[PDB]
Write a protein that binds this DNA or RNA. Sequence first.
RNA 1: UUUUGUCCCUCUCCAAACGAGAGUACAUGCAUGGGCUGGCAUGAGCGGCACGCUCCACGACCGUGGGGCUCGAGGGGCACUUUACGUCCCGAGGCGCUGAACCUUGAUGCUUGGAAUUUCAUGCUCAGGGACUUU
RNA 2: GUGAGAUUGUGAAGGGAUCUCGCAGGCAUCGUGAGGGAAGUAUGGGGUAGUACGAGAGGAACUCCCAUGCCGUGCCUCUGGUUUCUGGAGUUUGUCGAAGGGCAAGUGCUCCGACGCUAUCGCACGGUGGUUCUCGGCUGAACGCCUCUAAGCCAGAAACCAGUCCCAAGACCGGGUGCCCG
RNA 3: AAGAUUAUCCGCGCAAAGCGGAGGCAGUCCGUUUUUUUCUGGGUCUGCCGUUCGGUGGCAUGUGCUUGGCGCUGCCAUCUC
RNA 4: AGCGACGUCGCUUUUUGAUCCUUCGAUGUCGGCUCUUCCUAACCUAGCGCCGCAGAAGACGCUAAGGGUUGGAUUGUUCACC
RNA 5: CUAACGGAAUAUUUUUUCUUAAAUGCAACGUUGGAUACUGGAGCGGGGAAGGAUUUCGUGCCAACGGCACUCGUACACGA
Lengths: 188, 100, 360
Amino acid sequence: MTRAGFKGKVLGKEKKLALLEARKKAAEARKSRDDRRWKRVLAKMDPEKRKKYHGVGNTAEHSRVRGCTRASLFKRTGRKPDNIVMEASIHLSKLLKKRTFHKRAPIAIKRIRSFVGKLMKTKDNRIDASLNTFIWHKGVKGVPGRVRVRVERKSETMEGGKRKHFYTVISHIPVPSFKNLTTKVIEQ
Amino acid sequence: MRTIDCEFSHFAVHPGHGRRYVPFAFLSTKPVLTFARPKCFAMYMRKKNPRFIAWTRTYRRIHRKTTTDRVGRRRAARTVRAERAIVGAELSYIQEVRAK
Amino acid sequence: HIVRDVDRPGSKVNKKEVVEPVTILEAPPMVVVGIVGYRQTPVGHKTIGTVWAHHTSVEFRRRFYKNWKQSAQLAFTKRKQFARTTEGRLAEARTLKAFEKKADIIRVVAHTQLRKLRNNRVGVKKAHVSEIQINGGTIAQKIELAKSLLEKEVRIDSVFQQSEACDVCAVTKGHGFTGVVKRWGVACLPRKTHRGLRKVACIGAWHPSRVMYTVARAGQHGYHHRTHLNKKIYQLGRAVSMEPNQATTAYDLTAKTITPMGGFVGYGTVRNDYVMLKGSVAGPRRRVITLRRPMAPQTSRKLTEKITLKFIDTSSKIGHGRFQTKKEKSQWYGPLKKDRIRREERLRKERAARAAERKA
RNA sequence: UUUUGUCCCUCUCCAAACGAGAGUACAUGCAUGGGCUGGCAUGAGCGGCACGCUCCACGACCGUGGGGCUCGAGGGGCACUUUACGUCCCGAGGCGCUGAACCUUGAUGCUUGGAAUUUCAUGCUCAGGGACUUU
RNA sequence: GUGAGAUUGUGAAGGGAUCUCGCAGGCAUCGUGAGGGAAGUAUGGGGUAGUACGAGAGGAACUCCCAUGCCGUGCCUCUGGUUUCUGGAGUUUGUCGAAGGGCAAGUGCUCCGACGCUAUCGCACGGUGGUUCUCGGCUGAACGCCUCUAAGCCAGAAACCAGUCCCAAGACCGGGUGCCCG
RNA sequence: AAGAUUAUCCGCGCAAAGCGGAGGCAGUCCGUUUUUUUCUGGGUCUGCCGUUCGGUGGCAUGUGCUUGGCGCUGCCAUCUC
RNA sequence: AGCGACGUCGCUUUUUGAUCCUUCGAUGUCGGCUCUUCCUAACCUAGCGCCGCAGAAGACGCUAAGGGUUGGAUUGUUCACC
RNA sequence: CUAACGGAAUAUUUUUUCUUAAAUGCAACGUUGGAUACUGGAGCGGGGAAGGAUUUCGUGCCAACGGCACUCGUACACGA
């Protein structure tokens, strides 16, 4: 009910909104720009065009440009993940449920790696020993349900097996209120 | 309408909710006591002391928990105390009664 | 559960206040988007014509595209052009003409405004439609009406007025792959039941070897359409009032919300208007559900009722229902280690000092 | 090219299929995770003549003062008030010390936990597509 | 009656596939119901009335009205129940110099426990048309009478058939629409 | 499907009978009149002129809705087509 | 009414017999539990006809298989039986 | 479980130039360290008897084979 009898506000909105809308509406040039790219792109795959081409945003741009610009900034115009360290906090509750006392925790470990890939959007996880203990703290049945990491996606040269060339370390670090506290991204 | 208060807890039992027992009572009659969460019954049954049970109405009441500053303050309500006449009398009778 | 008064001609529980279970159903408007004529042919209804929106919103397109995803959304665009075709095909002339000429059931194409103003859980944000037959005087009159209602929006109250019995079509709550028992209700054998137990003793005869169908077997259970009847609409809601408000509920005397302290799991919702039906409701939690006019004449002690809510208790649920209204609840503890005084008072000056500083 | 499917991803569906969706990005999706909702039922910790608590007040956040309340014991025992060392109790006894406390109360309705599949914000962060069918 | 052109094809002085060819399809969407299936059921109150009926003894009946059953079919506000939420809390034994705080104890062990599940131990809901059965009839000739009967015809039962409901129309049902095609 | 109807149209009207409504202009390729009655056509290309739309913008307003944002119409003007 | 003797024909096959076709290089014996569905020679329910049916109550018949149709006890049971 | 190492811990793609990213191998199997458990001495421990006897070790080495599997061996191979 946010207006009535709160006199005259009406003219103010209708117009005011009239800009914000107009602006929003206005705010892009779209799909065909990409269809000029496509006829060529079907000739073979260009991601530097693609990660940024894939996203848009017309009601966001005073605020989305804030998150997008970092992330676009190495990443959405030409990928190239850093080489970053962040320190995080994860919610085991959903994670630990149901299945066996005897398996929850190893699987958690796997899952930890997985989260990390998931997080770093950009995959591969090496873990600190402390974490190793941290985990096996009880040993299976229980585990401590909330985790504190310092994680580094670090860059590597040509290395290793499989598919190697970029790599991560993830580590324990602690002090509770984890569920409030947050993860923060470690300036590099 | 009509909320009983689940005694033990004290909590208002809206028309649904909870469960109802009828006890005996000779200094009055025949009550019903309505219990909310059987946790409240069980504890009762478990014959705990309302005077120490956290969750009860008693427990606040008795326990520092209600106490003094919140609403138990006294000797601060409005009043007047002052000197009063007979009413329906000339000045001389009012002097005579008050005096000697 | 709800409170309302009893009475009838000579019931046992006449003259009583009663408390009853009720359902609440999220509601805002569907917008009328087309008109349909199927005509009855001696082979049933066959659609004869469909009548249009002239403006086609994105959601509805999102559904009206198999998806959004990369969707170019290009549906309707030609259709979209058609405002020109005022000066162009007077399709409307043709349609109507047909309608008059022949149509026999008129359905209206309506679809929802599917955000429903909901936040989160649940989704299928795709969008949804259905045909609604309209009945009540004269094809043209109907049509006019319909026509008049084209692009126009519907609120339940426009087709309803409460106290009413209505009928319901829904998908069961799902159970997946089901123990035949739940699916059908068979009874076991002893403890000494070698080689299993649920799976009952006798199922077919030699004659006829042809396994009989009056036995069943396991299977899905739940997730069914069922087209269920006689659900009374006990109340028709509107306009969520604010920075906390809408409701008002008489004897509430408070001006509450129509939302429980919880107010539906995964669904802390009430985000527009509601249908309060007496009783419960089919299907899975959190889901879309179809109200249809009742078919029973419903003549009854029941219809024939002065069901005219008074009052609804509005628990928590969640954690248990223990203290109605967060408002009340708040009182009872009132002060605690947090905030309150020993933190809030500090907070009020502290806050005051900061606020003043940033401005000056 | 139009795609749909598939990378991607949801839990309502869900054995698998299948389904149902989806983001498609900003008061978002997304998570930190805020707030907030619960729940269980007063922590650790520390304290008992101080300190706590409580009231008032000032400073207003504070420092602080005032007022008021509060203002928990069971212990084997042992020292020392001496040669003047002003300890100026010399004993009576007082002052401490002395292994464990036990329960308690207080600060503390604490403390603590609240998803898998909780509530939401005028919070925070993060990021938003590989394939391939393919007309 | 008997195309072409491309694509495409291979082992034998060439055929053909494939596609696309004088009007292709895609996608999507929304639809109809053939036809199948198909469900409710009885007893109780109120009441009639102590009325009818009966001389009495005794002693009935419908609407009508309220209910209820069992059955069916939904459901979870509530309540109950269920707990590996290893959720909380609590407790023993042992186990970690050391409290803390964990551990083991093949879910150590209790009390508490939402949620979810779920229970006739919880909550909800169960449509009106037709044709007939007997049967009675009506009319009614045979047969100058008469007859329900022949002709004719009315009315008609928990029966059946449909409505409703559950499937979705021929492995081969089709309509209506959006958008790309050709 | 509507007449044994393919011709400059549509609409309306059982149906009659009838009715109404029915843009232009120049430039351009090809060529008939014939289900027994066009009658210059056919045919595209352009050009050129104008209801509509389509877009642009603005101004009001109506409408409608959230974490006052989202959503849409009037009219006006512009813009374009 | 309702019967129905004496007769005297029917009718059936959830009886029991008779018969040995088949089955012995195999068609898993009791009972019972469960569970379905079906049959009608309808016990109950719907509705008709009769009554040696006043009421009352029963009885008889039709039309009807759509619907319904039990707990124990004792007894392996079956049957029996309270 | 984990890090590490060590084996044929081996790969990858291409528009782009391209490479991170974006899609699976390796070796699921070795070791050393590390982390967690378990047994629970009537040992899964440690020693005989019969039984067996080369299985032992060393070294090698990985076709089969050890029901997965081995880059490990009571295998093979070669010797001791």
